Ligand binder design. Structure first.
Ligand SMILES: CCn1nc(C)cc1C(=O)/N=c1\n(C)c2cc(C(N)=O)ccc2n1C/C(C)=C(\C)Cn1/c(=N/C(=O)c2cc(C)nn2CC)n(C)c2cc(C(N)=O)cc(OCc3cccc(OC)c3)c21
Lengths: 156, 158
């Protein structure tokens, strides 16, 4: 019954439930067609400070788009000690942009303290929705800091 | 900090604030009449059908609103006494689909009574965001029934 609950349900109903059923087959088509294979599962970055940059760290490099289906998903390499240590489909949780905007607009009556509480609640709520819906993994973190090491810990 | 508050802000930040600044130029290009506002249908029961061009016999698809993301918007004629009584850009408020889904799934802990309360609060919150937003968008909230008469009542106020 919070801001976070509506955002988690909208993100699941309006996006994840529509793209997750076909993701495994798209990754497989990419790996079969074309060092190291693209890991299965969609990795969602959840910066709890709600700082979502315009273009997804020196050790996270874009490689290619995945074959569509009107969904654009990107494959990245993760570097460790300067070399490729993993490859995966990665993307930011867009509802955290709305939490950031609500903290910025006075009309929302939503403080930066409310924002962090709702970001944590969004992560927990989304985790619980996905646990009850049998190809996805949430990477929550609060930002020196290495995002590549954060993703690599989940991949391994 | 209610469910409605987050849905109204996501719908504004992630859709309306991006589409509304170019709406007047798109309507002007088609007219050069179609009303100057985006009319958003808000069925408070949260029943959003798959196709608006088949929702009412007196709401007929006229044309796609041209370009001046690439947004797809539709222009409809509203009939009264079998004749064109108004023309406007019309579409359903998609966040009401999430309110419907939350009432359907036990995990959400969200009753049909909560759904209607949040649907009304979503309408109020969105109207207040749009009233103060930068200087073209009207909300049509409603619960035999004529949807064309509902839209025409709003159009005739403008
Ligand atoms: C919606 C689920 N969701 N809930 C929360 C919380 C956050 C998210 C979320 O972030 N959603 C998405 N992600 C991460 C996505 C990633 C990918 C990918 N991998 O490529 C692809 C799609 C993705 N979507 C779906 C989006 C962005 C829409 C459907 C936007 N949209 C929209 N929105 C609303 O209903 C809504 C309700 C609430 C509440 N808040 N909103 C605003 C978001 N309406 C009416 C739209 C109408 C039109 C029109 N008139 O034709 C067009 C739209 O968008 C054309 C478009 C085209 C291409 C790229 C593009 O942007 C990528 C957008 C409309």
């Amino acid at each position: 019954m919070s801001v976070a609950h509506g955002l988690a349900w909208s993100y699941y109903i309006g996006y994840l439930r529509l793209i997750l059923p076909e993701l495994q087959a798209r990754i497989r088509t990419y790996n079969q067609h074309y060092r190291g294979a693209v890991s299965q599962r969609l990795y969602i970055l959840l910066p709890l400070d709600c700082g979502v940059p315009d273009n997804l760290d020196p050790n996270i490099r874009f490689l290619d788009k995945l074959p569509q289906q009107v969904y654009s998903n990107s494959i990245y390499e993760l570097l460790e000690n300067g070399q490729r240590a993993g490859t995966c489909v990665l993307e930011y949780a867009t509802p955290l942009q709305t939490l950031f905007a609500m903290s910025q607009y006075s009309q929302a009556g939503f403080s930066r303290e409310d924002r962090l509480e709702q970001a944590k609640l969004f992560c927990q709520t989304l985790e619980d929705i996905l646990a009850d819906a049998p190809n996805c993994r949430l990477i929550a973190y609060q930002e020196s800091f290495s995002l590549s090491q954060e993703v690599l810990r989940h991949l391994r």
